[PDB]
Symmetry: C2
Subunit: 47 residues, 2 copies
């Protein structure tokens, strides 16, 4: 026995909100954290 | 034969920027004025 005790956590979560909602019902697709992916792709060509 | 002239225009250009650049790369889908279409769709579900 290391220990009868432990430290569990609570459920994650996600939704289609800002740009994920638009594309889902317009382009028909969606991505985890499109805001992030979008920020990092655009910024990446600004160095 | 009527007046030879015309009130002719120039050319209209459409570019990939911002939202539809990210989605064109990530989702491979491009759409016209996605920024405008996105505005209204996020609008019309709010009073």
């Amino acid at each position: 026995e290391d220990t009868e005790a432990d430290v569990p956590v609570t459920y994650g979560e996600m939704v289609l909100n800002g740009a994920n909602l638009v594309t889902a019902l317009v382009m028909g697709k969606a991505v985890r954290s499109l805001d992030d992916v979008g920020r990092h792709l655009l910024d990446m060509q600004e160095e």
